[PDB]
Design a protein around this ligand. Structure first.
Ligand SMILES: Nc1nc2c(ncn2[C@@H]2O[C@H](COP(=O)(O)OP(=O)(O)O)[C@@H](O)[C@H]2O)c(=O)[nH]1
Length: 330
């Protein structure tokens, strides 16, 4: 019957690709809200050290698949270089690459109170969990979602504690989940408060990898009009659509693609099938090895948050799907 090429482009257009209308409006609803928060921050909280919150995520750069239902709103903290320093996780006793301790420097000389964020310090370290709670409470305590919603003809209601998430119904039957992501930038190190999976690492900030990864990907496709992004979206759609693959993330799949791009120059449209197969094969062998290095930061293993058992099950699921092509593609 059909070639894999056709099946994939077909799968992409009927499953991976968000319908044209829905993505514009979802994205626009997010844009509309982000702006209204810009003015709220000027008026209500000129005291809290922040910069303007801005959108980020797959929906914002057209990498979101199946449904336009989520996006991040970054909350950039202001931290003074003099007062704070970030510590690579591999240099901590935790020994976890891709994560940082954010340390409060010399309290004898910089007493508590020198930074607003000193209230979020636990044992000399800026706690990511506590920053989230404080922000959530300081926002919850000054914000008027019913009014912002009325102003934009959206209904906006926070969610149950996931208190850092907003549910935006922007049409009768459409909604969008915006979650707030507190971020810190020290030097050229960008960190986000997206907690490590295990509880014992909850004092660590996460190295933000998404911007460089997606910029890299976009630059490569731009250069040669390649299908790197198209292949990623298909994979994302499969993992999202297949429960057994729920542990796979956009970040891992993107790096699978980027590693492959180091070794395949030809990403013309007709090579899509071949690259997709290579990517599947790559992912499987990364899983077997128990290690998927970040293309942009080799020291970081993007499977390090997964247990060996989960890695093993992911590997098995994928092998099995090789002989169930029609379950993999819907
Ligand atoms: N926007 C953003 N999300 C990040 C970052 N680091 C980790 N994440 C997480 O990774 C996910 C973002 O996924 P995304 O790239 O948008 O692809 P998708 O959610 O699978 O469509 C969310 O769960 C984020 O919390 C980051 O630096 N920026």
């Amino acid at each position: 019957r059909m070639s894999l090429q056709e099946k994939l482009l077909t799968y992409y257009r009927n499953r991976a690709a968000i319908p044209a209308g829905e993505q514009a409006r979802a994205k626009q609803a997010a844009v509309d809200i982000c702006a209204e928060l810009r003015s709220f921050l000027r008026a209500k909280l000129p005291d809290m050290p922040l910069r303007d919150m801005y959108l980020s995520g797959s929906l914002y750069d057209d990498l979101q698949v199946v449904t336009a239902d989520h996006i991040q709103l970054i909350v950039p903290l202001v931290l003074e270089q003099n007062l704070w320093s970030c510590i690579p996780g591999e240099d901590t006793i935790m020994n976890v690459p891709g994560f940082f301790l954010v340390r409060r420097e010399n309290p004898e000389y910089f007493p508590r109170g020198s930074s607003y964020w000193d209230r979020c310090v636990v044992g000399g370290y800026l706690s990511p969990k506590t920053v989230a709670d404080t922000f959530e409470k300081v926002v919850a305590g000054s914000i008027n979602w019913p009014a912002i919603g009325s102003l934009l003809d959206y209904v906006i209601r926070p969610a149950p504690p996931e208190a850092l998430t907003l549910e935006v119904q922007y049409e009768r039957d459409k909604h969008l989940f915006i979650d707030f992501l507190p971020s810190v930038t020290l030097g050229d190190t960008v960190l986000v408060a997206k907690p490590h999976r295990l509880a014992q690492y909850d004092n660590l900030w996460r190295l933000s990898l998404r911007p460089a990864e997606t910029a890299r990907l976009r630059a490569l496709d731009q250069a040669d009009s390649g299908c790197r992004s198209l292949c990623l979206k298909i994979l994302k759609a499969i993992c999202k659509s297949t429960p057994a693959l729920g542990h796979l993330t956009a970040s891992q799949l993107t790096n699978v693609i980027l590693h492959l791009a180091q070794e395949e120059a030809d990403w013309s449209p007709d090579m899509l099938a071949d690259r997709f197969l290579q990517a599947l094969r790559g992912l499987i062998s990364y899983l077997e090895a128990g290690v998927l290095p970040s293309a942009l930061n080799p020291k970081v293993n993007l499977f390090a948050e997964l247990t060996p058992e989960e890695i093993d099950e992911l590997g098995y699921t994928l092998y099995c799907s090789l002989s169930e092509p029609e379950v993999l593609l819907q």
